[PDB]
Amino acid sequence: HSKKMEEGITVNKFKPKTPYVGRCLLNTKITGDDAPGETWHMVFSHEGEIPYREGQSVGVIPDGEDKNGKPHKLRLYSIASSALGDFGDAKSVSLCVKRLIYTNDAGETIKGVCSNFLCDLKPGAEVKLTGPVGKEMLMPKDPNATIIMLGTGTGIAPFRSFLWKMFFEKHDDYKFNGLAWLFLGVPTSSSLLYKEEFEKMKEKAPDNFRLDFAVSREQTNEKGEKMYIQTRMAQYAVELWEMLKKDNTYVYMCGLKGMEKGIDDIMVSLAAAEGIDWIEYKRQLKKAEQWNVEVY
């Protein structure tokens, strides 16, 4: 029945009342000092106890108590590593995390709880994890699919997961031969997450992988508009629209809630030109498992 790799997935092997306790192996800042905000890539040991698949998330329970002396609520993070992991042994899990800093009502600076807990982690520290969680972002079973990936910021995470599996790994029962097209919206060049990895992939499979960046604060279109992901998509409108009409095309979107509207804004217009109501067409795609969304 499913078009996605849903068979034999694990879900919530570990729960908040009984998390798995893993350890921090590495924690590196992957954005430049220039960047507006910090994003870190961190890898934890799970010794094979968390049997996740590409596209799933884990929950993290930050250490400490809430204001009622209870344990903090879990926060969800998409896994940024493939099932084998960054070390190829299936015993680690990686996260891509933005440090959340804001000012409250009184002008006071407030640090987000889990994000600052995670970005401050030192190798050797323990971390409580739950999950795995999710079925929405699982990859398509079809190894010849056209997979379009639209992410903003940390929303690159699940796509890194997919792409490692597709392009950096050898699998007995899976060999990707379709077309993968990643669009990634970030603010600055010092914020182009995992670009070096994607450039290696592109070199390996030039015919199977397309890559486009939308560097919001550095790029403008012709009208001098800010290069958001939707802005960059428009430049390929005809192409993308054609792709959307095929049954073997799967769209995945991950990142800021905001991107979702912007993209709908472009599609409404593209479709209307062909006499199609985007709202119904999108509903049909969602039902056919071709339009997959995880924004937050």
Ligand SMILES: Cc1cc2nc3c(=O)[nH]c(=O)nc-3n(C[C@H](O)[C@H](O)[C@H](O)COP(=O)(O)OP(=O)(O)OC[C@H]3O[C@@H](n4cnc5c(N)ncnc54)[C@H](O)[C@@H]3O)c2cc1C
């Ligand atoms: C499915 C899923 C996957 C996700 N994947 C990831 C991922 O891979 N990487 C990642 O970094 N995050 C991801 N997130 C977000 C993550 O779950 C946390 O929400 C994020 O790290 C912030 O949590 P925190 O505990 O640091 O902040 P909290 O202490 O929970 O602070 C959050 C609160 O900050 C406030 N806030 C935020 N900005 C402002 C502002 N400008 N002004 C006033 N208040 C503000 C709001 O009250 C908000 O609810 C994901 C979320 C979901 C649901």
Ligand SMILES: Nc1ncnc2c1ncn2[C@@H]1O[C@H](COP(=O)(O)O)[C@@H](O)[C@H]1OP(=O)(O)O
């Ligand atoms: N509504 C939106 N639609 C598309 N991209 C967005 C939207 N809001 C913010 N962005 C961009 O998403 C990226 C988020 O990455 P990061 O977490 O590193 O900041 C940035 O380039 C940010 O642009 P900007 O901040 O210049 O408005």
